[PDB]
């Protein structure tokens with residue numbers, strides 16, 4: 001797991017996200033979609049987005065980004081004690097949305113990139129280590145539920 005020190009770093013970094021949840025959410029999803037266009041195909045509500053301009057101009061994409069990061073922030077504030085929060089997400093993503101664990105890897109990487117991009121020189125080596133661990137824990141606990149369901 002993460003240490004107390006590490007959790008404190010994670011939630012300190014998260015303060016940056018909470019100051020502009022929509023901006024961060026948008027950039028995360030744009031980073032995902034542009035870097036991995038197959039991921040866009042998982043969203044019937046975003047498949048019409050043919051260009052990054054169109055993505056950037058989509059109010060609904062920003063709305064979804066807020067939903068995404070709000071759910072993730074809920075999970076993070078539980079400091080690993082997130083069974084109740086993570087289980088239904090694991091299950092809707094495997095059973096309904098059909099999201100391979102690789103895509104969760106993609107978005108984890110996207111969050112790290114976006115933090116650097118929006119906060120260059122203000123997301124230190126310790127911060128990245130702690131946030132990376134938190135995102136890995138999240139991914140790994142989802143992966144456990146995916147295996148349970150035989151998904152992917």
Ligand code: MNR
Pocket residue numbers: 039040042043044045067068069071072088089092093097099103104107
């Ligand atoms: C590649 C695509 C996918 C990735 C990566 C991904 C990653 C993540 C992620 C990682 C940080 C979090 C947190 C996250 C959280 C959510 N997510 Mn998700 N998600 N996610 C979808 C695709 C993906 N998610 C789709 C498709 C829907 C339904 C969208 C709609 O039509 O309204 C959805 C829906 C949702 C919803 C709405 C409730 C539900 O349906 O369970 C939340 C919350």
